[PDB]
Amino acid sequence: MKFTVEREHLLKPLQQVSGPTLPILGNLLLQVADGTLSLTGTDLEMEMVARVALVQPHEPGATTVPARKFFDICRGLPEGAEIAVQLEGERMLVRSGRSRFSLSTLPAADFPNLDWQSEVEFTLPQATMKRLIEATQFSMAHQDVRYYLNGMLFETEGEELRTVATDGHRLAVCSMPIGQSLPSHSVIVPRKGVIELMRMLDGGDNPLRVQIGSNNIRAHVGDFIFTSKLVDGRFPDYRRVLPKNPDKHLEAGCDLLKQAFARAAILSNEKFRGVRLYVSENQLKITANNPEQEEAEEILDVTYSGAEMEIGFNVSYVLDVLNALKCENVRMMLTDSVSSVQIEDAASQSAAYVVMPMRL
Amino acid sequence: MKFTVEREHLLKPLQQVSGPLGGRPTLPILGNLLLQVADGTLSLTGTDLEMEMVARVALVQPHEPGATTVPARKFFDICRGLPEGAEIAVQLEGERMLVRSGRSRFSLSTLPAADFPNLDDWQSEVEFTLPQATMKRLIEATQFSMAHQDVRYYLNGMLFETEGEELRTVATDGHRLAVCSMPIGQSLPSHSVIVPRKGVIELMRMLDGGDNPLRVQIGSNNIRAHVGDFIFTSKLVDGRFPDYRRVLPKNPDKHLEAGCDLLKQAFARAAILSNEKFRGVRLYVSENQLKITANNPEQEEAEEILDVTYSGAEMEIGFNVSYVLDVLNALKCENVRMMLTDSVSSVQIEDAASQSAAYVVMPMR
Ligand SMILES: NC(=O)c1ccc(F)c(F)c1
Ligand SMILES: [Ca+2]
Ligand SMILES: [Ca+2]
Ligand SMILES: [Cl-]
């Protein structure tokens, strides 16, 4: 196995595959075949494959090498450098100018593979997939004993793709049109997979091709291919989480609401930061207090209809929403002091957020 | 005690005087700032018992004199959180201090000003002024060589030395040493004081970058620095610092000169295949050539060859590459000079263009 390639052509591929307990999982698979260098990183749950065209003389074959070391060496070389690689048994030689490196190797034969069959396929702009994941990702559970919440629902319905994420306390749902008639289907992508998929997306104009199997999801963009296993459980139905009949509607500036929440939060309990909301005619009052007897009060002029009520919220849950909205005005749709609240951009139905109240 | 101050006139003072704080304040009052309104000025003070940062804020709005202490981080965060241009009204009310701006209201618990720790008074024995740029140079040149929580406490600080028309800093952790001397333009008596690690950091933090020079005062047991409307004072570390003079190699006539960047990037790449713990690389110096190699237990190998200027006998010498990298990063120059002796002796490293900074790194087995 021998190739010579510009450092420049390796950098972004290396960045992506350095993404995805067993030493060989810390290695990259390198393969030269039919004029192409392929670089694969895996963690057994997901894999990223990148391809680089080889115009300079090259010899087929494969090996695996320490990924972080190989990446650091390449990154470390000067801009414009050319990188010549040759496999020498249990070592891979790397040369560029008067810099020389010998890396240990593990056999390509030992490198783990994920085969499976695609059941649902569609293409969409990167930008749309990025939008979907950013709108919802923060509501994924992290290390919940209900495994199926540690990730993100991808659902196809009609001509829309939809993401849903929830941790049982707050929920986020976003739908975007994809312009193709689609089968009704739902899968759960593990959180680490969501994160790696999002990192593959640079917001250039580039179609993303998605293929969903019973147990896997694959996304193709440019010369990269990402594959993850799916999470095997029963995701909650967002439709059953949306408040059935909110009778109280508050509209307020997103930024003013956010800043009042953030300031009030300073004098909330540091362990469990919550604030009390009091809604009344034309007005929202946010209050916090702490074990030191300190108190914050914010009063905001707001658009409001409904009965007066008091309701508490976890500060981070609301700030997370207001941060994901990045819009001028926000609508909060309330029911009562013991029920969850629906938050959305006042001027867009693309996404919705549901948040349980917090007792204070 | 009462004042009303525009947000942005209070914010950087609050940031600056919070410097010496934690984190985890050992006792509550050490997590507080002292606020004193007196003769048309708000003073803010934070302390950790070893040092204090004081800021003076002029009061253009109606105010009333008095003093209290309130939690620094909460007070800062409230002020930072208010919208730009916000007028921040403050009034002491016994056990609470009230903060109001627009329809934002906050109540903070106070501790009496009478109980705020207060660095004892002391006398200055030497005083000079110098550019902010010069002090930043002295500290950045040597800071990285200070020890980290060494049981030899004196090393966990930085030596400041005045001698003739020079101010000098020294730092070492016993393995490597950094010395930097800069002209002052006034003649100074001989003083040698150790500044505590956190004090060195605060000196750095307080150098804004404008035309305000720095006024320094040093006594037997304290140092003080004035910049703009800030006064930093620290207690000094009560120890005898090792002498840099007797640590500089005696006769390093083997003289190598190389491009700083080329040298740095070569050591950086070779470091990748150095032992993860010990970070050893080998240098083979030969006529106008440097060969850096690294290998680790798995017998991965890196080899960088560089053109350099060198005439002396060939030799082989081992260094912790992290130590070497720290020096090259702190030099920020075009060419470096390395002054060698033998494989079991320290190397002295300098900007090829200036003897103002010098670095001593001991070899590894
Ligand atoms: N059943 C659920 O998973 C759920 C998720 C988020 C909520 F806010 C909620 F009220 C319920
Ligand atoms: Ca104003
Ligand atoms: Ca000197
Ligand atoms: Cl290519």
Residue B241 carries which side chain, given as an amino acid letter?
F
| End-to-end CA, chain A | 66
Backbone angles phi, psi at B220, to 5 degrees: -60, -30
Residue A236 CA: nearest ligand 1 atom is 3
- Cβ–ligand 1 distance for A170 under 6 Å, the answer yes
Does B276 lie in the same domain as B217? no
Q: Please state, in angstroms and rounded to a whole number, the distance separating the CA atoms of residues B174 and B167.
A: 22
- Cβ–ligand 1 distance for A335 under 6 Å, the answer no
Half-sphere exposure of B157 (CA within 13 A, CB side): 23
Q: Please state, in angstroms and rounded to a whole number, the distance separating the CA atoms of residues A11 and A247.
A: 55
Does A286 lie in the same domain as A232? no
Residue B22 carries which side chain, given as an amino acid letter?
G
- Determine the Cα angle at A13 with ends A8 and A17, to 5°: 150
Residues with CB under 5 A from ligand 3 (ion): B 179, 181
Residue A240 Cα, ligand 1 centroid: separation in angstroms?
8
The edge-to-edge listing of strands for the beta sheet with A27-33 is A61-66, A27-33, A36-42, A46-53, A224-229, A216-221, A207-212, A120-125
Residue B364: partners with Cβ closer than 8 Å, 6 or more residues away: B278, B280, B318, B319, B320
Helical axes A126-136 vs A315-325, angle rounded to 10°: 160
Does A159 lie in the same domain as A108? no
Helical axes B197-205 vs B132-142, angle rounded to 10°: 140
Half-sphere exposure of B155 (CA within 13 A, CB side): 17
Does A220 lie in the same domain as A113? no
Q: Which residues on chain A are in Cβ contact (under 8 Å) with B103?
A: 297-300
Q: Please state, in angstroms and rounded to a whole number, the distance separating the CA atoms of residues A83 and B262.
A: 18
Residue A62: partners with Cβ closer than 8 Å, 6 or more residues away: A1, A29, A30, A31, A32, A33, A108
- Where among B247, B274, B305 does a domain terminate? B247
Does A4 lie in the same domain as A112? yes
What does each C-alpha distance from B253 to B71, B311, B341 come to in angstroms? 58, 10, 7
- In contact, B122 and B130? CB cutoff 8 Å: no
* Closest of A258, A255, A239, A357 to residue A309, by C-alpha: A357
The edge-to-edge listing of strands for the beta sheet with B41-47 is B66-71, B32-38, B41-47, B51-58, B230-235, B222-227, B214-218, B126-130
Instruction: Indicate the helix (H) or strand (E) that contains B143.
Output: none
Residue B59: partners with Cβ closer than 8 Å, 6 or more residues away: B3, B5, B37, B40, B41, B42
Q: Please state, in angstroms and rounded to a whole number, the distance separating the CA atoms of residues B343 and B324.
A: 16
Backbone angles phi, psi at A147, to 5 degrees: -35, -45
Does A129 lie in the same domain as A226? yes
The SS3 of residue B155 is helix
Q: Please state, in angstroms and rounded to a whole number, the distance separating the CA atoms of residues B264 and B333.
A: 11
Q: Please state, in angstroms and rounded to a whole number, the distance separating the CA atoms of residues A306 and A334.
A: 9
Here the CATH number for the domain that contains residue A16 is 3.10.150.10
Q: Please state, in angstroms and rounded to a whole number, the distance separating the CA atoms of residues B64 and B45.
A: 18
As given in the structure block, the two tokens for residue A205 are 């104009």
C-alpha radius of gyration, chain A, whole number: 25
Backbone angles phi, psi at B340, to 5 degrees: -110, 160
Residue B337 Cα, ligand 3 centroid: separation in angstroms?
14
What number of other Cβ atoms are within 10 A of residue A326's Cβ?
Answer: 10
Exposure string over A267-278, b if 16+ CB within 10 A, otherwise e: bbeeeebbbbbe
3-state secondary structure chain A: CEEEEEHHHHHHHHHHHCCCCCHHHHEEEEEEECCEEEEEEECCCEEEEEEEECCCCCECEEEEEEHHHHHHHHHHCCCCCEEEEEEECCEEEEEECCEEEEEECECHHHCCCCCCCCCEEEEEEHHHHHHHHHHHHHHCCCCCCCHHHCEEEEEEEEEEEEEEEECCCEEEEEEEEEEEEEEEEEEEEEHHHHHHHHHCCCCCCCEEEEEECCCEEEEEECCEEEEEECECCCCCCHHHHCCCCCCEEEEEEHHHHHHHHHHHHCCCCCCCCEEEEEEECCEEEEEEECCCCCEEEEEEECEEECCCEEEEEEHHHHHHHHHHHCCCEEEEEECCCCCCEEEEECCCCCEEEEECCCCC
Backbone angles phi, psi at A105, to 5 degrees: -140, 155
List residues bridging with A125 in a β-sheet: A207
What does the CA dihedral B326, B329, B333, B338 come to, rounded to 10 degrees? 20
**Is any Cβ of chain A less than 8 angstroms from the Cβ of B332?**
no
Method: X-ray
Backbone angles phi, psi at B180, to 5 degrees: -140, 130
Does B365 lie in the same domain as B263? yes
Residue B45: partners with Cβ closer than 8 Å, 6 or more residues away: B17, B33, B34, B36, B52, B53, B54, B55, B116
- In contact, B128 and B166? CB cutoff 8 Å: no
- B33-36: long-range contacts, CB 8 A cutoff, minimum separation 24: B33/B69, B33/B70, B33/B71, B33/B72, B33/B75, B34/B67, B34/B68, B34/B69, B34/B113, B34/B116, B35/B1, B35/B67, B35/B68, B35/B69, B35/B70, B35/B90, B35/B97, B35/B113, B36/B1, B36/B66, B36/B67, B36/B113
CA-based torsion, B316, B321, B326, B331: positive or negative = positive
The SS3 of residue B353 is coil
List residues bridging with A51 in a β-sheet: A38
- Where among A241, A262, A282 does a domain terminate? A241
Full residue range of the structural domain in which residue B179 is found? 124-247
The SS3 of residue B194 is strand
Residue in A with minimal Cα distance to B292? A99
Q: Please state, in angstroms and rounded to a whole number, the distance separating the CA atoms of residues B184 and B137.
A: 13
Q: Please state, in angstroms and rounded to a whole number, the distance separating the CA atoms of residues B140 and B112.
A: 38
As given in the structure block, the two tokens for residue A199 are 């990192």
Residue A52: partners with Cβ closer than 8 Å, 6 or more residues away: A5, A9, A10, A13, A36, A37, A38, A39, A223
- In contact, A315 and A300? CB cutoff 8 Å: no
The partner residue sitting opposite B81, judged by closest CB among A77, A91, A263, is: A263
* Closest of B91, B93, B82, B85 to residue B62, by C-alpha: B91
Does A360 lie in the same domain as A257? yes
Residues with CB under 5 A from ligand 2 (ion): B 85, 87
Exposure string over A132-150, b if 16+ CB within 10 A, otherwise e: bbbbbbbbbbeeeeeebbb
- Determine the Cα angle at A116 with ends A186 and A223, to 5°: 90
The SS3 of residue B49 is coil
- In contact, B83 and A265? CB cutoff 8 Å: no
User: Is B109's CB within 8 Å of A292's CB?
Assistant: yes
User: Is A263's CB within 8 Å of B104's CB?
Assistant: yes
C-alpha radius of gyration, chain B, whole number: 25
What does each C-alpha distance from A106 to A41, A66, A140 come to in angstroms? 14, 9, 36
Does A249 lie in the same domain as A189? no
Residue B58 carries which side chain, given as an amino acid letter?
A
- In contact, B209 and B132? CB cutoff 8 Å: yes
Does A170 lie in the same domain as A73? no
As given in the structure block, the two tokens for residue A187 are 């899968």
Closest ligand (CA of A38): 4
DSSP code of residue B64: B
Residue B169: partners with Cβ closer than 8 Å, 6 or more residues away: B138, B139, B141, B142, B158, B159, B160, B161, B178, B179, B180
Strands A120-125 and A207-212: antiparallel
List, as ranges, residues 255-314 from A with C-beta within 8 Å of B: 259-260, 262-263, 266-267, 292-300
User: Is B107's CB within 8 Å of A295's CB?
Assistant: yes
DSSP code of residue B241: P
Residue whose Cα lies nearest atom 2 of ligand 1: it is A168
- Where among A241, A272, A302 does a domain terminate? A241
Closest ligand (CA of B168): 3
As given in the structure block, the two tokens for residue A12 are 């972004």
- In contact, B218 and B162? CB cutoff 8 Å: yes
Does B312 lie in the same domain as B209? no
Does B67 lie in the same domain as B25? yes
- In contact, B284 and B314? CB cutoff 8 Å: yes
Instruction: Indicate the helix (H) or strand (E) that contains B80.
Output: helix B72-81
Q: What length is written for chain B?
A: 365
What does each C-alpha distance from A254 to A2, A257, A282, B38 come to in angstroms? 57, 5, 16, 41
Number of structural domains, chain B?
3
* Closest of A13, A29, A41 to residue A106, by C-alpha: A29
Q: Please state, in angstroms and rounded to a whole number, the distance separating the CA atoms of residues A211 and A312.
A: 42
Q: Please state, in angstroms and rounded to a whole number, the distance separating the CA atoms of residues A85 and A71.
A: 13
Q: What length is written for chain A?
A: 360
What number of other Cβ atoms are within 10 A of residue B220's Cβ?
Answer: 12
Resolution value in angstroms: 1.7
Residue A354 CA: nearest ligand 1 atom is 8
